[PDB]
Design a protein around this ligand. Structure first.
Ligand code: E4G
Length: 377
């Protein structure tokens, strides 16, 4: 019954992917950001300049107040609000209704994005990182516990405005080609994984693999960029600069601040390298890799001039909180969050990226010794 969930996600480039949900009785319809990088279900519940609608608890006969406040600080933005529960449904999802925790946002700071068309956030990660603490059951745990929906979901994020699929409760084989490759979920808080090797244009970055996961590596549909720890980011930017030195760019471009533009249809894709991330596999000493094309980490953006050029932002940036495999990394692929088996699956997506001499790929097996040394402690 998964065909009803294909193409149930929408978005704008760099403003997140959202799914339509309803809360309350009678149903109030809201667009909810799909975020595997957090664990709180939260919606606008008070007027805001960027909100076109919001949750009105007074109009819901099933609303229950929890008489507890809550605040969430993300890497970008923060909000505070009041906790409660209400009935929730996903129109283009499973045909069920769950009573779920809902944080009603009353104040926020650089959280809602002007023109993104979503009004709330659906944190799909685990209770351990829920606010105010791990006793607030996340939505997906409530869904699995109150229905027969199997304990997994999959995300097909399609690039540039944008669309995709969230298959709730299973895997839809028409959304990917080739084999699924699985990496263990290292610990159930974020969707934490272990990166064991990094290559740029086939050259190993030759860093101690601990650097790749200092202090963690997560799969996060709620973050746009590939974010890398300082030492790793510097190494990768140096390698990407050298591969593209045929042309030179402002240093503000390499920091994500300024665009780069080219005459429409003349983007020099071939001078930007491919990035290969090797992930811990399912059997001893075995890994696999996902290969990222520049069409993923050069994010297309609106024209800042009176021209019809093709303009891009560098979508790799620095982090002080570990590696973040953001939406730009996920866009090539079908990503299976197999919570039941504590693993994350990767396969080439049906909406894969098209370079003309190169292709995004998921390839294995590879042999990698001492993979467990790559995890940070
Ligand atoms: C250019 C870049 O890419 C820079 O960095 C970015 C960019 C970015 C969002 C985040 C970070 C962001 O913070 N996104 C969080 C995720 O949940 C974060 N996950 C990890 C995390 C970090 C800190 C604390 C927690 C707790 C709550 C568990 C979790 C979710 C989120 C918050 C606010 C707006 C969002 C989406 O709009 C979606 C469109 C993308 C917005 O662009």
């Amino acid at each position: 019954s998964f065909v009803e969930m294909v193409d149930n996600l929408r978005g704008k480039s760099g403003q997140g992917y959202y799914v339509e949900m309803t809360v309350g009785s009678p149903p109030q319809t809201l667009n909810i950001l799909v975020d595997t990088g957090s664990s709180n279900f939260a919606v606008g519940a008070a007027p805001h300049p960027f909100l076109h609608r919001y949750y009105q608890r007074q109009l819901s006969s099933t609303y229950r107040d929890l008489r507890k406040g809550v605040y969430v600080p993300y890497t970008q933005g923060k909000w505070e609000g009041e906790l409660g529960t209400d009935l929730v449904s996903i129109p283009h999802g499973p045909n069920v209704t769950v009573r779920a925790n809902i944080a009603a946002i009353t104040e926020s700071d650089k959280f809602f994005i002007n023109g993104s068309n979503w009004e709330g956030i659906l944190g799909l990660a685990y209770a351990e990182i829920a606010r105010p603490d791990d006793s607030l059951e996340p939505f997906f745990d409530s869904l699995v516990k109150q229905t027969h929906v199997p304990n997994l979901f999959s995300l097909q994020l399609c690039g540039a405005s944008v669309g995709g699929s969230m298959i709730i409760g299973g895997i839809d084989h028409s959304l990917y080609t080739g084999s699924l490759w699985y990496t263990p979920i290292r610990r159930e808080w974020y969707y934490e994984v272990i990166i064991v090797r990094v290559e740029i244009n086939g050259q190993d970055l030759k860093m101690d693999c601990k650097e790749y996961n200092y202090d963690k590596s997560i799969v996060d549909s709620g973050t746009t960029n590939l974010r890398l720890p300082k030492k790793v980011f510097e190494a990768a930017v140096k390698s990407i600069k050298a591969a593209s030195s045929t042309e030179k760019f402002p240093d503000g471009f390499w920091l994500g601040e300024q665009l780069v533009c080219w005459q429409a249809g003349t983007t020099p894709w071939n001078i930007f390298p491919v990035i290969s991330l090797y992930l811990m596999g399912e059997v001893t000493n075995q890994s696999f890799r996902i290969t990222i094309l520049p069409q993923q980490y050069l994010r297309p953006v609106e024209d800042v001039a009176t021209s019809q050029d093709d303009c891009y932002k560098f979508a790799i940036s620095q982090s002080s909180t570990g590696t973040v495999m953001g939406a730009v990394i996920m866009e090539g692929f079908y990503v299976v969050f197999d919570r039941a088996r504590k693993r994350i699956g990767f396969a080439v997506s049906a909406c894969h990226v098209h370079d003309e001499f190169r292709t995004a790929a998921v390839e294995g097996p590879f042999v990698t010794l001492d993979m467990e040394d790559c995890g940070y402690n």
